[PDB]
């Protein structure tokens, strides 16, 4: 088979690395199309394997499954730019924020009647081949579409499906996740580095503690809660730390982040509606 | 070789459970020792393998590499305990927070003149290999001791040799860690479900999410910083969720936590001074 | 080379553009006109003595001007708009400095007199006076491309300058335009707190300056985000990072995002007033 | 000066930067500089080897192959880098200690042990030396010259603003212009943030909101007014840099800054009396 992007932000860059890396695909298989290509992911795409084309076009007439990596504000320009190339063959598969499927399919409907739409929710990591994926398909999809679907970005990280209206829910978590986890490896490293660790230290610590911390949950039936009790030794060093999180509200700055992106999310769907 | 454990906590488990995991100790080359000894964790760790007795003296005879993995309050009577079976042979390495190499080797030199020893700040993540651990040599222990110590622990997670004054420090980031991050997932769920995502999903794509940007920072040369500035889209979900992160302050308890455990780490040496 | 510029408007921002432009030499010898209803006699003085020439009228600019600045404020443009439309030509290039104001607004009014004026926006900072300022600016639908690069040439004597679409100036004005007195405020407190500490008020407000114009050109001269470099001179244990954790505990991250944000919100609202 | 040789102590972020600001303003030949580190696997020894500086892993070849001598080491490590070399300071040695905290008086008597007379200046400068843009101000010594204290004056105006002060001072100066980059790069980052919230590419905002700063401080440079009245120039009736404003003030944003270079300066002294 072979894939396509439309776009060439950091999440077609990212999924065309995971997916190589992965050998799911030969990168000459991988096609991807950009309105400004920056030298670097230009080069890094060219020595990835990658073919490139400034066209659109192009890059829907030699691929079958096609990824939609582009903002959400520019979805329906593409749609509308492609949608007399689309061939029975093809399975689009949205990865904007918020666009439902519902706008996707009526676009590409005014061209031939029954598209196969696939929306999703990914995030970059994926390039580590460690994502955290999630998909709902359209009207027209075949079975063996979501199967594919699932099997593919199931090579570069965790995978399921969902109903649709729970994805706008899954950004605010998974899909904005990692910039969360990054503020918090800053911080954490500030707060090693004040109490006098080199700052390369202070980073590698701090990321492969939740590293760790991440496997061990994932890789037990409990929920966090009852891993923070196990390892929350009484009147230790954790407990103590812990409190102090408590007492500045930690916990509900976190389900106001996923509240907040969740939200914004649905705005990104209403504003290009 | 073979490795024994002094204390049957949380730790002297995910130790024998990493080290065995790795291949690199056949676990009937492990002995452990306890007061109390749950009906578990005895199961758990007989039907591990391990061998176990409720004499801490059986375990110093049996074993080359001695783990310490009990309370600070408890390692000067462990170490009157089993100071006179020390043997020339024998690497003693204490996990317990706070406790100095100074203080140990002055335990320990009142029988034999030289006790090899090593003090090691390591997290509970070592059951699922990816730990966190860094140690520091005492005052007689040969080259060879502390590269075996760095091999050993290597086959478990990340090690590294540090000078001691570091791993006050160090606990206050990697051996608390988990507990922030446990924290921070069990905050990220309840912020799924809020936004409608049954428990089991969120807990699961929290934890992805996380584990996929520790991985992505990892396996980059950049630090948090740039990897946030490279994720964050304008206008979109993520960049919204930050400011509410940045509302509340966010980074700055993370700071708050890593400094109260590196004092309240100091504060457990003291009292047992 | 042969072009004159005007000014319509006599605030503290055409007065920095004036002594920008002149500083920079990008004009020849008597090229640049102001005009305004009751400009203060210190400014008088200043721009005569600069070699700018001064009139009351708006039409005498218009007149002898190229390239129309309007440097007045939001709820103003619709008035002088109607004032000089009839006397806008096609050499004519209309440049809006006022925040909000859409291109659209302006091509409205000004093509009831002519049908293609043309018409720039741009949103600059008042550093232009020490050739250190920050400019965006977006064309309208009549502009000719030479317009644009005329632009761009012209603003770059006087500090950094792209062009953006126009639906980013807003933003643009929440950042680098409100972006100095975000500046002064910032170094009074740390004069303040460099005086709690004993410093001379004097020595105090020059050594704020000076560390953060040597940051800022840091920045500048790297291919570094901000991020990175905090982490370059934040030494272990020491009092940097002792002072970074004391502006995080009272959120100094977040105030700087609200600012920008309230800034970006009431420059469109400036827009919508007008409309 | 085209005939002294400086020397650096400590290879790091410091040394660095005041070599590449002092070769870029051509005030010294860069194979007159020579610099000692504990570790050669730096990132910032690598870029000294690229500029033309002599590196030795012995901090006595720098003493002996040096006139102007600048510590650039961790407090806590003064004392021991003066124990080492104390026996090979010479009398045509100026001795420029930078690190934060440590008093003129401690290292005059540590020096005193061997040598009589030791020339000892202290100074606190910044990393924007590497753009000739740093902030220094220094106080002399009990044995130091008069032409010492200008020919200190000389070479460190070469690289940014610079100012002889009481040693009272210098801790204080530590927490405004020594911290000061620090505050600017977290106020940059923010900055950054906002502009992309409101839909900025990343890039543009970084570069907007670096020349928005850079231009307002050197407005301020350039005026006889202090910060207040700028603010009122530049803030227009019910504009959008006034309602900004406000959402500072109700944040508390000023006293942040206060309270910054107060922690910074408390720290320092601390970091002297530990060593102490
Ligand atoms: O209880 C957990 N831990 C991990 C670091 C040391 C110990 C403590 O909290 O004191
Ligand atoms: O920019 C990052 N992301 C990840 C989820 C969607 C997108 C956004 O912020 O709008
Ligand atoms: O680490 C950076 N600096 C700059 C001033 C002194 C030193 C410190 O923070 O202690
Ligand atoms: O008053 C100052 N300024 C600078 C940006 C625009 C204008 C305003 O605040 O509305």
């Given at each position: 088979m072979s894939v396509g992007f439309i776009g060439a932000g950091q999440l077609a860059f990212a999924l065309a690395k995971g997916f190589t890396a992965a050998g799911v695909l030969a990168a000459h298989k991988i096609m991807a199309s950009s309105p400004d290509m920056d030298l670097a992911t230009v080069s890094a795409l060219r020595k990835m394997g990658v073919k490139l084309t400034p066209h659109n076009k192009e890059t829907v007439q030699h691929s079958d499954v096609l990824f939609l990596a582009v903002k959400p504000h520019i979805i329906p320009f593409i749609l509308d730019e492609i949608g007399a190339d689309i061939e029975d063959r093809h399975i689009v598969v949205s990865c904007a924020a918020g666009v439902t499927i519902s706008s996707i399919e009526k676009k590409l409907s005014a061209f031939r009647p029954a598209p196969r739409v696939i929306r999703c929710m990914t995030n970059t990591p994926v390039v580590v081949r460690e994502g955290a994926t999630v998909y709902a398909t359209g009207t027209h999809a075949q079975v063996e579409d979501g199967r594919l679907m699932e099997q593919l970005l199931?090579?570069?990280?965790?995978?399921?499906?969902?109903?649709?209206?729970?994805?706008?829910?899954?950004?605010?978590?998974?899909?904005?996740?990692?910039?969360?986890?990054?503020?918090?490896?800053?911080?954490?490293?500030?707060?090693?580095?004040?109490?006098?660790?080199?700052?390369?230290?202070?980073?590698?610590?701090?990321?492969?503690?939740?590293?760790?911390?991440?496997?061990?949950?994932?890789?037990?039936?409990?929920?966090?809660?009852?891993?923070?009790?196990?390892?929350?030794?009484?009147?230790?060093?954790?407990?103590?730390?812990?409190?102090?999180?408590?007492?500045?509200?930690?916990?509900?700055?976190?389900?106001?982040?996923?509240?907040?992106?969740?939200?914004?999310?649905?705005?990104?769907?209403?504003?290009?509606?």
């Open positions: 199931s090579s570069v990280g965790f995978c399921t499906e969902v109903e649709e209206d729970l994805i706008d829910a899954v950004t605010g978590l998974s899909g904005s996740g990692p910039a969360y986890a990054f503020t918090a490896l800053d911080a954490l490293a500030d707060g090693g580095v004040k109490m006098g660790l080199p700052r390369r230290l202070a980073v590698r610590l701090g990321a492969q503690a939740l590293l760790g911390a991440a496997k061990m949950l994932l890789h037990s039936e409990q929920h966090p809660g009852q891993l923070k009790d196990n390892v929350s030794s009484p009147g230790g060093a954790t407990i103590h730390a812990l409190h102090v999180l408590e007492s500045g509200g930690f916990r509900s700055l976190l389900i106001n982040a996923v509240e907040a992106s969740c939200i914004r999310t649905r705005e990104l769907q209403s504003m290009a509606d």
